């Protein structure tokens, strides 16, 4: 009678039990094979150098269903150590997830894992719920994709959803590139993991790019020392803010899309004028790639410069926001009122996989 919460991302699986304050298991959303039959998640990365790793979720959309089944199997049995037949399972989906995808999630849950009940919730909406809100605009940025999702009373507004096909994997790749331009060598998959750790420990968003570039050129005050696993010490400099600057200026990696301040403004402006005041004041940031220090102050500055002069702008950035989607699902699935919202196996038997559009919205 304890529901499960499975938040499947492009880079990370987040899984646990509804009512808990954090997922029990967080592991890479990968399946590896020889370049046993397949390795899933934590064990596939532990042999990352001897296997072809595949990502069944790309840009937040499930695209390899066989490997996804393997991820879901690994989650239930190896990580959560539950029988899925005994637990209602809340899953999460990207914004604008194709109709056919939602149906196959349902079909696999009921027919393959024999769950008693399930549900598919939109990741960004869950993140709003974790912050205690039901109206707002979410900026959700993970490992594969970045969305602005404006939400009125629990309904995402699909005509105003913006996408940016750039997120944490691109930033890691970009930090790798500019660190090698400085002289270092990050080529192996072990070294790419070091760059990801440098990204997550030392990068930040500058309030103003040019001022910060000028400080970094004229002093050592923004340099950081990083100790490598073998004990070597390297110093990181303007790379710390150049890497996440790509979020506001995607041209750095050759993308002519708008930055996240402009997708945020353009998404508010696709919404009816009467709800824009509430959006502007309820700008929730979620996902691992919103974790950079300085990002809320920079966003505040940038949106202020785009918005009417009198508008109250508030950036909300919970300290736990790399798990905000999951925490939202943990909240929703442990509420008394939600218990009639499940799709039941009985409902599934009568209506079929397309029941998911009727009950999950």
């Amino acid at each position: 009678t304890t529901a499960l919460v499975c938040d499947n991302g492009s880079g990370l699986v987040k899984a646990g039990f509804a009512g808990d304050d954090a997922p029990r298991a967080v592991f890479p959303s990968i399946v590896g094979r020889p370049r046993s039959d397949s390795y899933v998640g934590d064990e596939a990365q532990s042999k990352r150098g001897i296997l072809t790793l595949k990502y069944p979720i790309e840009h937040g959309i499930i695209t390899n269903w066989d490997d996804m089944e393997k991820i879901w199997h690994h989650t239930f049995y190896n990580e959560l150590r539950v029988a899925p037949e005994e637990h209602p399972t809340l899953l999460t989906e990207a914004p604008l997830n194709p109709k056919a995808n939602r149906e196959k999630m349902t079909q696999i849950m009921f027919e393959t894992f024999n769950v008693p009940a399930m549900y598919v919730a939109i990741q960004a909406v869950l993140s709003l719920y974790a912050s205690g809100r039901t109206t707002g605009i979410v900026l959700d940025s993970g490992d594969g994709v970045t969305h602005n999702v404006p939400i009125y009373e629990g309904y995402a507004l699909p005509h105003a959803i913006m996408r940016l096909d750039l997120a944490g994997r691109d930033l890691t790749d970009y930090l790798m590139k500019i660190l090698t331009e400085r002289g270092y060598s990050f080529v192996t998959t072990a070294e790419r993991e070091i760059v990801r750790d440098i990204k997550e420990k030392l990068c930040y968003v500058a309030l103003d790019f040019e001022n910060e570039m000028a400080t970094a050129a004229s002093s050592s005050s923004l340099e950081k020392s990083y100790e490598l696993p073998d004990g070597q010490v390297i110093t990181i400099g303007n790379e710390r803010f150049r890497c996440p600057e790509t979020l506001f200026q995607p041209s750095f990696i050759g993308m002519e899309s708008a930055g996240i301040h402009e997708t945020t403004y353009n998404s508010i402006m696709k919404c009816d004028i009467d709800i824009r005041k509430d959006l502007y004041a309820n700008n929730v940031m979620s996902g691992g790639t919103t974790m950079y220090p300085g990002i809320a102050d920079r966003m505040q500055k940038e949106i202020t410069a785009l918005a009417p002069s009198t508008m109250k702008i508030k950036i909300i950035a919970p300290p736990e926001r790399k798990y905000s989607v999951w925490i939202g699902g943990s909240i929703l699935a442990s509420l008394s009122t939600f218990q009639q919202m499940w799709i039941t196996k009985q409902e599934y038997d009568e209506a079929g996989p397309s029941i998911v559009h009727r009950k999950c919205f």
Binding site: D21, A22, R24, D42, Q45, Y129, R133, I331, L332, F338
Partner: peptide
């Protein structure tokens, strides 16, 4: 008058993550 309305109210008044049972994460990156 709507189940949806009651759910939205239940979300707003849930006290958020403080009311949730504290657990440990087995966290690989």
């Amino acid at each position: 008058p709507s189940l949806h309305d009651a759910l939205m109210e239940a979300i707003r008044s849930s006290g958020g993550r403080e009311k949730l049972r504290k657990v440990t994460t087995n966290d690989r990156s």
